[PDB]
Design an enzyme around this catalytic site. Structure first.
Site, short mmCIF file in Angstrom:
data_model
loop_
_atom_site.label_atom_id
_atom_site.label_comp_id
_atom_site.label_asym_id
_atom_site.label_seq_id
_atom_site.Cartn_x
_atom_site.Cartn_y
_atom_site.Cartn_z
N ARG A 1 -14.58 -30.22 -4.50
CA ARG A 1 -14.05 -30.85 -6.37
C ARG A 1 -13.90 -32.40 -5.58
O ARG A 1 -14.26 -33.39 -4.20
CB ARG A 1 -12.44 -31.28 -6.36
CG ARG A 1 -11.82 -32.70 -6.44
CD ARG A 1 -10.79 -32.13 -7.86
NE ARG A 1 -9.19 -32.06 -7.98
CZ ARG A 1 -8.73 -31.72 -7.85
NH1 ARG A 1 -9.30 -30.77 -9.08
NH2 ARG A 1 -7.26 -31.77 -8.08
N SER B 1 -8.02 -32.50 -3.08
CA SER B 1 -9.20 -30.96 -3.28
C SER B 1 -8.96 -30.43 -4.71
O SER B 1 -7.85 -29.85 -5.00
CB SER B 1 -9.42 -30.51 -1.77
OG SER B 1 -7.38 -30.68 -1.47
N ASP C 1 -14.93 -27.29 0.03
CA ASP C 1 -13.99 -27.94 -2.23
C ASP C 1 -14.86 -27.92 -2.17
O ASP C 1 -15.79 -28.28 -2.16
CB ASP C 1 -13.15 -28.06 -2.00
CG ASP C 1 -12.98 -29.33 -1.65
OD1 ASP C 1 -13.95 -30.11 -1.27
OD2 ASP C 1 -12.02 -30.14 -2.66
N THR D 1 -10.58 -34.15 -0.52
CA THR D 1 -11.29 -32.53 0.09
C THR D 1 -10.50 -32.21 1.47
O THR D 1 -10.17 -32.76 2.15
CB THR D 1 -12.50 -33.97 0.52
OG1 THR D 1 -13.19 -34.40 -0.05
CG2 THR D 1 -13.88 -33.19 1.59
N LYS E 1 -20.42 -30.12 -0.45
CA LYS E 1 -20.28 -31.02 0.74
C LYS E 1 -20.84 -30.45 1.91
O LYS E 1 -21.14 -31.14 2.90
CB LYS E 1 -18.59 -30.67 0.89
CG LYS E 1 -18.18 -31.85 -0.67
CD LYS E 1 -16.48 -31.36 -0.77
CE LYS E 1 -15.76 -32.25 -1.72
NZ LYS E 1 -14.75 -32.13 -1.64
N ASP F 1 -3.33 -30.25 -1.24
CA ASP F 1 -4.13 -31.32 -1.36
C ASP F 1 -4.64 -31.23 -2.61
O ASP F 1 -5.34 -31.10 -3.19
CB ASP F 1 -4.95 -31.66 -0.56
CG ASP F 1 -5.34 -33.01 -0.35
OD1 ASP F 1 -5.01 -34.43 -1.26
OD2 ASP F 1 -6.83 -32.87 -0.55
N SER G 1 -9.05 -34.93 3.22
CA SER G 1 -7.77 -35.37 3.17
C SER G 1 -6.63 -34.17 2.64
O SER G 1 -5.34 -33.92 3.00
CB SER G 1 -7.49 -35.90 1.14
OG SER G 1 -8.01 -35.01 0.60
N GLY H 1 -14.78 -37.85 3.67
CA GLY H 1 -14.72 -39.29 3.97
C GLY H 1 -16.09 -39.85 2.84
O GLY H 1 -15.91 -39.46 1.51
#
Ligand SMILES: *[B]([O])([O])[C]([C][C]([C])[C])[N]C(=O)C1=[C]N([C]2[C][C][C][C][C]2)N=N1
Lengths: 202, 231, 235, 204, 232, 236, 227, 220, 239
Positions: free
Chosen positions: H19, H169, H17, H1, H33, H166, H129, H47
């Site tokens: 995902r 994400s 993002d 994320t 999001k 990452d 993340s 989170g």
């Protein structure tokens, strides 16, 4: 974290770093640790960010209401006593190292120390945070009674700068504050303005 | 209209004064204390021939050494009788010894004035118990007869009569009772006094006598036993 | 029928129950309070109802705090519970903020508690009035007065009880401001001997308590010697 | 894991003007199978079905409490519940036990009342809604199911074409899982019919 | 919550609320009870005998347990509350003690709950009377009667409700040791008692007998019609 | 004028659908024997109240009807003195609670509304009586400038240009009505004082009234001093 | 503490006088007119303080419960504030569970429940206000009326407050099924003009309309032009 | 994320993002999001997905209720206080780290709320993340008082940094521009990832799957 | 506090409960509700008291409510009290179905609501519910049923009944017109209309609902405007 508060005739001088780290990462590199509790009453926060913010908000609320009923500028000792109450009550749930410092018409410029456990002790100058361990010997050998409001600002800037270099949890800029009877005066010390000490080299 | 906890101008709680007036409509129960045990006798007062007289329990057992005769609103006395039974059972569990007769009467007299509307709980009395009790037992001090009324005042008496015809019965005990009278003599005196103040011709199924002696336990006379003293 | 409960207004707009509670304060003995240049002097004329009582019984002067005094009038049973309510507030305040409670705040805090009994049917208004006196280096000499309705005001010279309209004309001749505390004690015991009725009433003990610079901001009962001499000056 | 105690897998696919909801029928305590006809899919109103996977005790509890709420909701505001509204209702129920949640991952599939637009979604144990446009899987063998649906699902399939895709995905996904299988039940929801057939699977 | 004292004493030591609860019991249907040797009977007069009313939904005779049953007089709504609380105690007594409750035990409980409502805050007394009839473990038929005040007594034969005095007097002179000699005899004594306080008795009477080691048995109209023919 | 039951004793509807008890609380506001006047200017709000001193022994300073609710909100209470302090204490707590929960200073109309909502509960519940006092809050809004609000014992509140309260409320409103149809800092204060003086017919001296103002240049509520209130007094 | 007994009880004839007395308070308040017309609903009310010292822009009679539901009342002002706050919390609560705007009919039912609770609870009197809720959901207009007793009725056009019977006659013979929102306002203001005593201006009345876009409270400008 | 936000010349630009993973498996490749708190206030949340939704949904209804009462535009401080006070009360058990950004009377404000209850008022923030990857772009190209288009490009590069570096994400990029006079919810703003085209068909011809039972039911 | 008390749950000299008796008087001034039990179903014929030329039709009905899958009811009394009572009836039926996973039997439901009505007449110091209900439903134990309930908490099963405005006049008419055991739904509707007219009709001044069984499923439906209209015309032919 490296907070520091010293006092002079007129009032007091505060100082802190601005780094907020979550492990080995700086989540906030320009954090404002000096929190105003009232007109002439500030407080340096150390320990847990969420715990110090919650307590400061609560004390600020209680002190504001108390000052409106009494119709008089609140005492610095009263603000420190409020902090101490919550710090002691929830000592097993909170992680704070508040340093209350302000100025009132009765006692003048005062600095109070409210460490983790919740005890309250008045000193002429106090240092807190994780980076205060490295400057314990420096403040004991440099502090002298009779310092003016100008020397106190240079004393605090020097000690904070020395703690920022050795501590990984301390760094960024330096936020100072000089509280007197006239009012509060904030000041930030960035890169070039931050006191520098020649690193020993061969 | 007034509340339940209202004092009168003479300094008396109205509710308690009316509760004491409700004990003048109940059956009579004469109790005589002697040196060789206590004796209790109540007037059953059956209102019908179809009505079983064995279901009328005016005299109950609080413990082996303590008995109890009640008058007035019998339904209200079932709560006081249970408190006394639990109090003497509790005492035994905690001190491994029998409770005294005066101690049992004291614990039952504490609930007497425990009532009120305001500042109360769900399981709180709304009025006082309109019933009088005659506690008779044997402890370390020997035979003892106690009397407790709606006000919550428990006193000791050598001979007591509570009920509708108490005034007439109380006077008949004042000149027929002495300190050296036997337990067998007391049973006859009570029966004689009961027969006089009663409306129906006294018989084995009309009244109910109980006795508590030093060495023995609480005992309720049967038909046979009752008949023996009746003739 | 508009005077049976405190949660009822009458057609004219008055709370009769609270007015009936003020009648109880006008039946009690006279207590006066005088504030001067550096202290407060409380004078209560204790009316001894019997000769069996000990000299000092049924006091009408209590210390609510170490710097605050309290003279009462009206019902004594109600006033004793109000004195314990004022002690709690003063004690709770020191454990929260860390210092002695200001008289202005203590008076207001206790007056608000007294005004809460004048709104509902579940309770009845306090049948007593009382004065609060204190002395503080930062503050000075303060003297507040609260009645049954929960109203608290600041004063120079106050008087409650039966003879309060006759005791206020005696306190108006004094120049309290320029006056000290040792000179006021005499005048305080003089006014109580003037307003007290020797005919209607019988024996009466004179109570005297003060708080100022003299006693270093500590409220106490006026010293026996000084009280005895002041009583002779009144006569 | 608590979720892998009873096994089972639910799948929901989207078609042109239809939806399909399939599930395994094996009910068993750990490695031992008890019955082979456990219900994992429940009807929430004509063209609305809810498939539950996870702890069998929580599968029945959640299905019964949701029905209890759904009955009261339909009586109060006399109308048929909408697919999107049911998801919010179910998500809310699951989020009440945020710190002592039900072990069940719901999979909702149905046609919107009056508009008849396909709707499929999935929620986690604490009620986290996830509305997709192709398919939604829930069970102990989601990885296997994810791989099947990803390479078999087509944008606009018809009732017959959709039935073949969801059956082939489930049959091949439950054959790679040990605690999943023992029969497969598929429900194809159309605009005027509800075909329900049990596929011939492996009894392993 | 309401915490007002409803039942209180009066000048003459009376409890008006309980007296008004007994006044409501007098306006109720007559409920007769007769204890026999191997059979306990219960008779209940049906005032509102409407032809458009399911009679199985409005009965005065209920069963608390398999050996205990009861009839009532007064407010029907209250009887239901008292009847269901007694049913829970029968099931509770069976869970704590292996044996079933005795007739007196359940009668004591029913009467104790009635006395509880005549002395607590915020509540009013029950407006019903009860005739608990049953058999114990020994096989001894039992008959008790509880009232609004909370007092209960054992009886041989009793009646409650409107015109209970007239029926009680008829039982006193008719209940002997020969009238309850046979099963039918005891059942015929209950039907005769209801014939003096009813209009055209025979189709307005509902009775239920309870023989030893057997559940409640409600005799239907046909059976009641056969008994009225023998009393002619 | 009809009535039945206990309508005059407790807050319950009467035959005509009125609340006598709430109407009796409006007569309790006049019991105090004082009048208050608040006039809204163009860049300032002015509160003017009568400061009567019955006894000379009474420490005058402590006698006041003006209160500082917040740093920018001030008010004037009229009616039962004990009720007034209680309501003033309530407004202080509600205002302090608002800043702690929302992060910003409470608006004058939000506080008034909040205090009026609490007063409406006393008109519905029968176990307590309504407060026999009035409240007139004045503050400077960041967007709408100067604000003058007022809530009474019935739980009804509103916004005004110029308001009055007390024994002479109809007099001060009938005089303010003809003055508004026709204001600067001095003009807002002079109009209030004149209204209070022409209705009471007393021609007030310095220490005989109290004034409170909240200008747009200095939003902090302040009480004019003895030498500050006198300057306006010698202007007319 | 608080009383725990009902203040509203049945009389010998079977009437709940307290509710009947609360309706008499609603029948003396400022007149209100609700009109449902094909593409929307209009709610108008006589917001006349008549004193010239009161701030017309401060108080509001027509309030928005949600984005598609508006409210108007007749009776007591302070009682309406409580019900409007309760109606706003009830709409939020419903939206927190179903994540979709509460239907007009569902809100009225929920808000009428609160009004019925004050007619049976201990130590309270019935609300002395009659509400005129209006909303728009599922491509359709709604108009409900919730009186002091807690009962609610669905109307097409109605009027409460002073001279409500007179306005119901003038509304029963001047309202048509096929009416547009814009024309609905004209007959809503005309019904309010038959019992307005003095002169009607843009600051003497308040009008709120409901349609496909959502509930809206007409500004002074709009009203002026309509007048 | 990867969620981020910056403060430009006259507004706020939020990004994130799309995902959502359930461990190391992609459950949703297009989830939203960026949550709506109010007309002028939005929120990016990382989170715990369930907690992030419930916390924002509750605070948005509280801000809507508050807005109806006051009758004014909500402030960013109000939303910040409500969130931070509620988060602190649950003692960090409500894993919801969000980026709060909006424009009110005081101007455009951007906050970052952490699970425990701490907040930070900075000119740019990143959460998730892939927060360190997006922070590197902000610490290398961010300038104060940027243009709307410049802020949208810089925030897109920050989300792209996290999406490509990452593992937690991926998918698309969501943007949200909040200014003094507008609110542009661009979803999706940029699509840097696209599933590869099929190399062959695997259609299941009818009759390929056996059936043991079959029951049709005609609905009305 | 004790002077303002009205003492609702209190006995009187005659032994009656005033409050409950005063609530029964309010049910006699309400819309007439009648229920008739047949062999293939049970119906509810209530008269609409909410008639006007400005009222909307909005809802599916006004007096007849659906308790659950196989139960329905018609109230008669305080309108707001029924809203509370019928909402509680739905809760009881849902709680029972959540426990035993089966529809709650009709008599168990009616009994549960009557226990709540009787609790308001014995303690709490609050006024009783001023409403009378009529229930129609179908269960596996007794099939089609019809129950009545009043403010006191009393209930009873019937074959034909009537609560409301002219209960006594309608009850008498049903007494001499109800062929017990040989009644069909079709022939019962005539009875309702015949009695409803002689106790007051248009097709908008009344509302009918029938409850029948079709393919192991209970079907509750309100008759349409046209559906009722025809019935009203057929009764005019016999008059
Ligand atoms: B200092 O280092 O002690 C400092 C004092 C605070 C700012 C008043 N503390 C922190 O650095 C700090 C960081 N955090 C959180 C850790 C988890 C993620 C959010 C920040 N808490 N205190």
């Amino acid at each position: 974290t490296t907070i520091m508060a010293v006092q002079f005739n007129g009032g007091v001088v505060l100082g802190a770093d601005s780094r907020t780290t979550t492990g080995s990462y700086i989540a906030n590199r320009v954090t404002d640790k000096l929190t105003p509790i009232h007109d002439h009453i500030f407080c340096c926060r150390s320990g847990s960010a969420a715990d110090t913010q919650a307590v400061a908000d609560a004390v600020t609320y209680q002190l504001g209401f108390h000052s409106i009923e009494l119709n008089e500028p609140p005492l610095v000792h009263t603000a420190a006593s409020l902090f101490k109450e919550m710090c002691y009550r929830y000592r097993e749930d909170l992680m704070a190292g508040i340093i209350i410092a302000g100025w009132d018409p009765q006692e003048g410029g005062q600095v109070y120390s409210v460490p983790m456990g919740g005890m309250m002790v008045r000193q002429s100058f106090a240092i807190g945070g994780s980076g205060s361990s490295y400057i314990y010997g420096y403040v004991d050998a440099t502090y002298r009674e009779g310092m003016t409001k100008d020397e106190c600002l240079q004393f605090t800037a020097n000690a904070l700068a020395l703690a920022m270099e050795r501590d990984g949890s301390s760094g960024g800029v330096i936020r100072l504050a000089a509280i007197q009877e006239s009012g509060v005066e904030r000041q930030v010390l960035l890169g070039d303005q931050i006191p520098k000490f020649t690193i020993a080299t061969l | 209209d007034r509340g339940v906890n209202t004092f009168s101008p003479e300094g008396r709680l109205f509710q308690v004064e009316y509760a004491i007036e409700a004990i003048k409509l109940g059956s009579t129960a004469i109790g005589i204390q002697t040196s060789e045990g206590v004796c209790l006798a109540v007037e059953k007062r059956i209102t019908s021939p179809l009505m079983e007289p064995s279901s009328i329990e005016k005299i109950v057992e609080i413990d082996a050494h303590i008995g109890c005769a009640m008058s007035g609103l019998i339904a209200d006395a079932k709560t006081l009788i249970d408190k006394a039974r639990v109090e003497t059972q509790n005492h035994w569990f905690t001190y491994n010894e029998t409770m005294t007769v005066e101690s049992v009467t004291q614990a039952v007299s504490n609930l007497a004035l425990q009532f009120g509307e305001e500042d109360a709980d769900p399981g709180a009395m709304s009025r006082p118990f309109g019933v009088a009790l005659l506690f008779g037992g044997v402890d370390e001090k020997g035979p003892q007869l106690f009397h407790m009324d709606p006000s919550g005042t428990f006193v000791q008496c050598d001979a007591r009569a509570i009920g509708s015809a108490s005034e007439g019965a109380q006077s008949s005990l004042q000149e027929v009772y002495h300190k050296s009278m036997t337990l067998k003599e007391a049973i006859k005196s009570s029966l004689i006094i009961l027969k006089q103040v009663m409306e129906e011709k006294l018989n084995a199924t009309n009244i109910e006598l109980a006795t508590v002696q030093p060495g023995q336990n609480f005992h309720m006379f049967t038909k046979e036993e009752l008949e023996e003293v009746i003739k | 029928g508009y005077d049976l409960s405190a949660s009822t207004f009458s057609p004219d707009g008055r709370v009769f129950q609270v007015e009936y509670a003020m009648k109880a304060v006008e039946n009690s003995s006279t207590a006066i309070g005088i504030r001067c240049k550096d202290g407060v002097v409380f004078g209560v004329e204790k009316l001894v109802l019997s000769k069996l009582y000990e000299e000092g019984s049924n006091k009408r002067l209590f210390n609510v705090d170490r710097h605050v005094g309290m003279a009462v009038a009206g019902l004594l049973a109600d006033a004793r519970s109000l004195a314990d309510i004022a002690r709690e507030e003063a004690s709770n305040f020191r454990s929260n903020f860390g210092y002695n409670i200001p008289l202005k705040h203590l008076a207001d805090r206790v007056a608000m508690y007294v005004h809460a009994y004048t709104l509902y049917s579940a309770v009845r208004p306090f049948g007593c009035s009382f004065m609060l006196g204190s002395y503080s280096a930062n503050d000075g000499a303060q003297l507040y007065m609260i009645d049954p309705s929960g109203v608290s005001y600041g004063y120079w010279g106050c008087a409650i009880g039966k003879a309060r309209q006759a005791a206020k004309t005696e306190i108006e001749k004094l120049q309290m401001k320029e006056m000290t505390c040792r000179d006021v004690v005499k005048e305080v015991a003089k006014i109580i001997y003037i307003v007290h009725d020797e005919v209607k009433d019988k024996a009466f003990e004179l109570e005297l308590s003060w708080v100022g610079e003299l006693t270093k901001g500590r409220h106490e009962i006026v010293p026996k010697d000084i009280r005895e001499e002041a009583e002779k000056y009144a006569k | 894991s608590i979720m892998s105690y009873n096994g089972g897998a639910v799948m929901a696919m989207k078609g042109k003007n239809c939806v399909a909801i399939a599930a395994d029928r094996r009910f068993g305590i750990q490695a031992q199978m008890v019955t082979t006809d456990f219900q994992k899919i429940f009807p929430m109103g004509d063209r609305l079905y809810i498939g539950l996977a996870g702890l069998a005790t929580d599968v029945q509890t959640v299905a019964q409490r949701l029905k209890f709420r759904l009955n009261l909701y339909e009586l109060k505001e006399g109308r048929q519940i909408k697919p999107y509204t049911l998801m919010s209702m179910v998500a809310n129920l699951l989020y009440e036990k945020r710190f002592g949640p039900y072990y069940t991952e719901p999979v909702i599939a149905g046609l919107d009342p009056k508009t008849f637009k396909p709707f499929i979604c999935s929620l986690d144990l604490i009620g986290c809604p996830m509305v997709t446009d192709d398919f939604v899987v829930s069970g102990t063998c989601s990885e296997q199911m994810y791989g099947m649906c990803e390479s078999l699902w087509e944008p606009n399939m018809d009732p017959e074409h959709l039935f073949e895709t969801i059956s082939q995905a489930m049959l091949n996904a439950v054959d790679r899982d040990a605690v999943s299988g023992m029969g497969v039940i598929v429900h194809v929801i159309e605009k005027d019919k509800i075909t329900t057939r049990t596929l011939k699977a492996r009894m392993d | 919550s309401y915490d007002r004292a409803i039942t209180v004493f009066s000048p003459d030591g009376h409890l008006f609320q309980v007296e008004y609860a007994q006044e409501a019991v007098k306006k109720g249907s007559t409920a007769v009870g007769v204890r026999g040797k191997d059979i306990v009977v219960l008779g209940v007069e049906k005032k509102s005998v409407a032809k458009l009313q399911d009679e199985r939904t409005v009965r005065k005779i209920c069963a608390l347990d398999d050996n205990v049953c009861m009839a009532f007089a007064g407010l029907t709504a209250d009887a239901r509350i008292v009847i269901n609380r007694a049913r829970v105690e029968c099931q509770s007594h069976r869970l704590t003690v292996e044996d079933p409750v005795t007739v007196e035990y359940i009668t004591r409980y029913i009467a104790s709950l009635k006395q509880r409502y005549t002395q607590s805050n915020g509540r009013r007394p029950f407006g019903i009377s009860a005739l608990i009839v049953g058999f114990d473990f020994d096989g001894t038929p039992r008959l008790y009667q509880t009232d609004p005040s909370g007092t209960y007594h054992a009886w041989k034969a009793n009646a409650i409700g409107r015109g209970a005095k007239s029926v009680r007097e008829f039982l006193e002179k008719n209940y002997t040791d020969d009238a309850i000699e046979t099963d039918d005899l005891t059942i015929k004594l209950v039907i005769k008692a209801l014939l003096e306080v009813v209009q055209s008795g025979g189709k307005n009477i509902e009775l239920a007998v309870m023989r030893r080691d057997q559940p409640l048995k409600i005799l239907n109209p046909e059976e009641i019609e056969k008994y009225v023919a023998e009393i002619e | 004028g009809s009535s039945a039951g206990f309508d005059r004793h407790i807050t319950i509807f009467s035959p005509e659908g009125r609340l006598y008890q709430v109407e009796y609380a409006f007569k309790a506001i006049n019991q105090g024997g004082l009048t208050s006047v608040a006039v809204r200017g163009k860049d300032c709000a002015v509160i003017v109240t009568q400061k009567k001193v019955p006894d000379k022994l009474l420490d005058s300073s402590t006698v006041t009807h003006l209160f500082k609710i917040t740093e920018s909100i001030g008010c004037v209470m009229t009616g039962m003195t004990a009720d007034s302090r209680s309501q003033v204490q309530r407004a202080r707590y509600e205002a302090a609670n608002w800043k702690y929960k929302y992060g910003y200073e409470i608006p004058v109309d939000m506080l008034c509304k909040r205090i009026a909502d609490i007063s409406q509960v006393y008109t519905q519940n029968a176990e307590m009586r309504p407060l026999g006092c009035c409240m007139i809050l004045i503050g400077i809004d960041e967007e709408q400038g100067p604000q003058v609000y007022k809530c009474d014992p019935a739980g009804y509140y509103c916004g005004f240009k110029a308001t009055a309260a007390g024994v002479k409320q109809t007099e001060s409103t009938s005089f303010l009505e003809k003055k508004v149809k026709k204001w600067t800092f001095e003009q807002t204060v002079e109009t209030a004082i004149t209204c209070l003086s022409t209705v009471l017919s007393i021609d007030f001296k310095p220490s005989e009234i109290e004034v409170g103002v909240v200008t747009v240049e200095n939003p902090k509520f302040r009480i004019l001093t003895e030498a500050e209130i006198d300057a306006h007094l010698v202007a007319l | 503490r608080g009383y725990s007994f009902s203040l509203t009880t049945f009389s010998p004839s079977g009437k709940l006088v307290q509710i009947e007395y609360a309706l008499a308070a609603v029948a003396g308040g400022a007149p209100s007119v609700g009109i449902k017309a094909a593409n929307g609903v209009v709610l108008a009310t006589e917001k006349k303080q008549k004193s010239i010292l009161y701030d017309e822009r401060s108080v509001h009679k027509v309030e928005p419960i949600t984005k598609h539901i508006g409210l108007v009342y007749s009776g007591m002002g302070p009682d309406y504030r409580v019900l409007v706050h309760r109606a706003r919390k009830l709409a939020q609560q419903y939206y927190l569970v179903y994540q979709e705007p509460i239907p007009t009919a569902q809100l009225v039912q929920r808000v009428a429940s609160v009004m019925q609770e004050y007619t049976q609870s201990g130590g309270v009197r019935p609300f002395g206000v009659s509400l005129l809720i209006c909303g728009w959901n599922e491509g359709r207009p709604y108009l409900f009326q919730s009186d002091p007793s807690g009962a609610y009725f669905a109307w097409k056009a109605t009027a409460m407050g002073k001279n409500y019977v007179n306005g119901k006659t003038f509304l029963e013979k001047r309202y048509n099924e096929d009416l547009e929102l814009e024309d609905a306002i004209h007959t809503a203001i005309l019904t309010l003009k038959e019992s307005f005593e003095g002169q009607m201006t843009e600051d003497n009345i308040e009008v709120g309309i409901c349609n496909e876009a959502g509930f809206r409270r007409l500004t002074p400008t709009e009203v002026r032009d309509y007048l | 994320t990867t969620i981020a936000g910056v403060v430009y010349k006259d507004g706020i630009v939020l990004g994130a993002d799309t995902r959502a993973t359930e461990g190391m498996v992609v459950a949703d490749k297009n989830c939203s999001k960026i949550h709506f708190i109010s007309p002028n206030i939005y929120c990016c949340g990382a989170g715990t997905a369930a907690d992030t939704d419930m916390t924002t949904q509750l605070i948005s209804s509280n801000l809507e209720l508050h807005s109806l009462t006051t009758g004014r535009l909500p402030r960013v401080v109000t939303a910040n206080r409500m969130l931070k006070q509620m988060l602190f009360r649950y003692q960090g058990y409500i894993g919801a780290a969000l980026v709060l950004g909006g424009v009110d009377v005081t101007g455009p404000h951007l906050y970052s709320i952490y699970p425990h209850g701490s907040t930070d008022k900075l000119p740019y923030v990143t959460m998730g993340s892939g927060s360190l990857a997006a922070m590197a772009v902000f610490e290398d190209k961010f300038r104060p008082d940027m243009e709307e288009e410049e802020a949208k490009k810089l925030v897109s590069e920050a989300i792209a940094a996290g999406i490509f570096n990452d593992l937690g994400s991926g998918s698309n990029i969501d943007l949200c521009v909040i200014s003094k006079s507008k609110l542009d919810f661009l979803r999706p703003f940029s699509v840097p990832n696209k599933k590869g085209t099929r190399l062959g068909r695997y259609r299941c011809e009818k009759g390929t799957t056996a059936v043991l039972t079959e029951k049709v039911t005609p609905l009305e | 506090s004790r002077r303002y008390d009205s003492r609702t749950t209190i006995f009187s000299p005659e032994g009656r409960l005033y409050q409950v008796e005063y609530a029964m008087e309010a049910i006699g001034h309400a819309g007439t509700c009648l229920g008739i039990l047949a062999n293939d179903g049970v119906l509810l014929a209530a008269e609409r008291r909410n008639i006007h030329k400005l009222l909307d039709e909005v809802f599916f009905s006004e007096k007849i409510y659906k308790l659950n899958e196989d139960m329905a009811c018609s109230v008669a009394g305080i309108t707001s009290d029924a809203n509370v009572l019928t909402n509680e009836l739905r809760l009881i039926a849902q709680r029972y179905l959540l426990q035993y996973q089966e529809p709650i039997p009709c008599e168990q439901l009616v009994t549960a609501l009557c226990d709540i009505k009787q609790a308001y007449t014995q303690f709490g110091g609050k006024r009783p519910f001023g409403v009378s209900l009529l229930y129609i439903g179908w269960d596996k134990h007794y099939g089609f049923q019809l129950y009545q309930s009043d403010p006191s908490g009393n209930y009873g099963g019937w074959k034909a009944t009537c609560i409301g405005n002219n209960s006594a006049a309608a009850v008498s008419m049903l007494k001499q017109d109800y062929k017990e055991g040989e009644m069909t739904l079709k022939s019962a509707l005539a009875l309702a209309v015949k009695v409803l007219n002689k106790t007051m009709l248009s097709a908008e001044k009344v509302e009918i609902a029938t409850l029948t069984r079709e393919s192991g499923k209970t079907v509750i439906r309100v008759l349409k405007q046209k559906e009722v209209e025809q019935l009203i015309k057929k009764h005019e032919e016999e008059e």
